[PDB]
């Protein structure tokens, strides 16, 4: 990406050689993944603002 | 552009900027419009 540029398009990404064709599954995961933030984790994994 | 008393006035790409020049009278040309999709989906 370019500096100070944001990417917003939530196109489904083909995570391998299996085409999504609009179907997320094997070797097809979204480019966006959610952080697993839990209070039990120590420093280095805790959420930071 | 002539108006006589169909769609024949398509919009023009902005590219990197526009230079405009006109010798017509002040009351003839009265502003401009800019955008991306020219509709609600863009400012």
């Amino acid at each position, epitope marked *: 990406l370019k500096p100070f540029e944001r990417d917003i398009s939530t196109e489904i990404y083909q995570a391998g050689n299996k085409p999504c064709n609009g179907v*997320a599954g094997p070797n097809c995961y*979204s480019p966006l993944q959610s952080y697993g933030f839990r209070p039990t984790y120590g420093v280095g994994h805790q959420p930071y603002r | 552009a002539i108006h006589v008393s169909r769609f024949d006035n398509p919009a023009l790409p902005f590219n990197d900027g526009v230079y405009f020049a006109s010798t017509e009278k002040s009351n003839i040309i009265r502003g401009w419009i800019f955008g991306t999709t020219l509709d609600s989906k863009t400012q």
Partner: nanobody
Framework: QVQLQESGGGLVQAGGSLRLSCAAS????????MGWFRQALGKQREGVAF???????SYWLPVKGRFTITRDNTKNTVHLQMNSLIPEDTAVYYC?????????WGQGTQVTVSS
């Protein structure tokens, strides 16, 4: 402030049908990309489907035919159609509006199916 009115959930028998819906009101922008997220009981949240402003649809599950998205451009709301329910989809649904500046979330709807 942004409010996401969610409705349509409840208890439905297996093989039933219903209509989930949410209206996005308040300060929205123009791209307005929306969709749905499923949360199983005590499990992680996954994306159900997504609809953009150009009618482009992206389903994040092998759920085609089961789930169908309809758009209301005049009021700009999203409806999801539940048909041929199976017990495996018993999860709470929150629709998601990533939009342009700040993404938002719904409050929750309980969709339940069992036999």
């Amino acid at each position: 402030q942004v409010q996401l009115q969610e409705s349509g959930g409840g208890l439905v028998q297996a093989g039933g049908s219903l209509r989930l819906s949410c209206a996005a009101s308040g300060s929205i922008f123009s791209p307005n990309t929306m969709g749905w997220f499923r949360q199983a009981l005590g499990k992680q949240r996954e994306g159900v489907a997504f609809i953009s402003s150009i009618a482009s649809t992206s389903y994040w599950l092998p759920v085609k035919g089961r789930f169908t998205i309809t758009r209301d451009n005049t009021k700009n709301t999203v409806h999801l159609q539940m048909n041929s329910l199976i017990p495996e989809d018993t999860a709470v649904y929150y629709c998601y509006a990533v939009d342009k500046s700040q993404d938002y979330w719904g409050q929750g709807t309980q969709v339940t199916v069992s036999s």
